[PDB]
């Protein structure tokens, strides 16, 4: 895997060269499908290596959900230095994998035939995507995971082909997805930034480090936050707010070039607060009108090989819409709220208008890129500030 854009051009993509995506060296000045929709689709599942079988995971079965939780907890994405691993919770996985329109065959597992052990996964969920001047029904691909003992055995290309086949069967021919690695061909490159909330714990676990000309006492004072948010009328989102949150979001996202197009049911699903999964706060002004909202989702990570600190509680910026409160004030209150809720760090990407507040609110740039990709869609690349899509 290549993490850098120039080091990826020294690479050969035996699998991705067979796929309908632009070549990494290609420069795109067209808008449309790489290849036409297929009007006949392979009916049989692709072949897995001997001893492994497909299994669609019913995540409404608590035991199966727990098997997925364990597969990801032990084998999903780690940082560069193998010190931290994502720790998606079971109830978070239910939120991310059963939005409106979810399909059981799109929760695509791989099991050992003998032991029944879950050793592979990939998922699709449906999403209407606005890309420049086109609105397309697509899927979002997420949670591609291969057990560590199954790695480097061409199992991931099979998972990609098999979910592609199952999506094609439902009449969808484009997808969107993100990754930390460079593949053919990013439609946009974003960067994670981090805002320390408990700088002490973060330095002790070597998530962060003390700056050269700074001390620990200075570091704690630098990152100190108000006890309570300052925006008048800020409160948790309630059911009565679902229409206005939908309206605010739809209007706000028109300015970007890669965005979701959410129904009101999708807005309920993605924003209605659920403890330890998703937080949404609206601004209800002195007239009783909701004029802004902030949101962030809960995604802890496992701290590997540490005798005392086992987990890092992280908040991830989701969608933040401002029409009367300045964005800078909204995000300051998000940090205060995340601090109040026990989070250790607040992460945000440099997409949408986030660059207007990252430096001012004392975020530090991260070392990991997040590349955005479209499958079977040719369009010009865009800068981070035009990406208006956040995936879990």
């Amino acid at each position: 895997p290549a993490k850098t854009m120039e080091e990826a051009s020294k690479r050969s993509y035996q699998f991705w060269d067979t796929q309908p995506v632009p070549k990494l060296g290609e420069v795109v000045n067209t808008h449309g499908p790489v290849e036409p929709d297929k009007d006949n689709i392979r009916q049989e599942p692709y072949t897995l290596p001997q001893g492994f079988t497909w299994d669609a995971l019913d995540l409404g079965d608590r035991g199966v959900l727990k098997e997925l939780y364990t597969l990801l907890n032990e084998n999903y994405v780690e940082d560069d230095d193998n010190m931290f691993r994502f720790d998606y919770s079971p109830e978070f996985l239910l939120w991310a994998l059963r939005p409106p329109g979810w399909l059981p065959q799109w929760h695509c597992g791989v099991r050992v035939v003998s032991s029944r052990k879950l050793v592979g996964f990939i998922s699709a969920i449906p999403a209407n995507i606005h890309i420049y001047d086109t609105e397309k029904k697509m899927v979002e691909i997420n949670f591609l995971c291969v057990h560590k003992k199954l790695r480097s055995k061409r199992v991931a290309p099979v998972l990609i082909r098999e979910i592609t086949r199952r999506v094609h069967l439902e009449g969808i021919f484009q997808a969107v997805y993100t990754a930390g690695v460079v593949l053919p061909k990013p439609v946009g490159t974003c960067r994670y930034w981090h805002r320390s909330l408990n700088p002490r714990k973060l330095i002790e676990v070597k998530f962060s480090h003390l700056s050269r000309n700074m001390t620990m006492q200075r570091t704690m004072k630098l990152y100190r936050l108000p006890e309570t948010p300052k925006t008048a009328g800020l409160r948790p989102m309630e059911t009565k707010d679902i229409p206005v949150v939908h309206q605010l979001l739809t209007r706000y996202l028109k300015q970007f070039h890669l965005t979701p197009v959410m129904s009101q049911e999708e807005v309920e699903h993605w924003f209605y607060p659920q403890e330890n999964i998703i937080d949404t706060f609206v601004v209800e002004n002195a007239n009783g009108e909701v004029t802004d909202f902030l949101s962030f989702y809960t995604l802890p990570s496992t701290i590997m090989n540490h005798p005392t600190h086992k987990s890092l509680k992280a908040a991830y910026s989701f969608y933040n819409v401002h029409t009367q409160t300045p964005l800078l004030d909204l995000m300051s209150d998000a940090l205060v709220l995340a601090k109040m809720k026990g989070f250790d760090v607040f992460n945000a990407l440099d997409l949408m208008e986030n660059k207007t507040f990252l430096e001012k609110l004392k975020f530090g740039i991260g070392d990991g890129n997040l590349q955005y990709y479209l499958y079977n869609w040719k369009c010009p690349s865009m800068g981070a500030e035009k990406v208006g899509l956040v995936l879990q």
Binding site: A179, G180, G368, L391
Partner: peptide
Amino acid sequence: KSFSKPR
């Protein structure tokens, strides 16, 4: 999806 540390 991509695990980032402060650079």
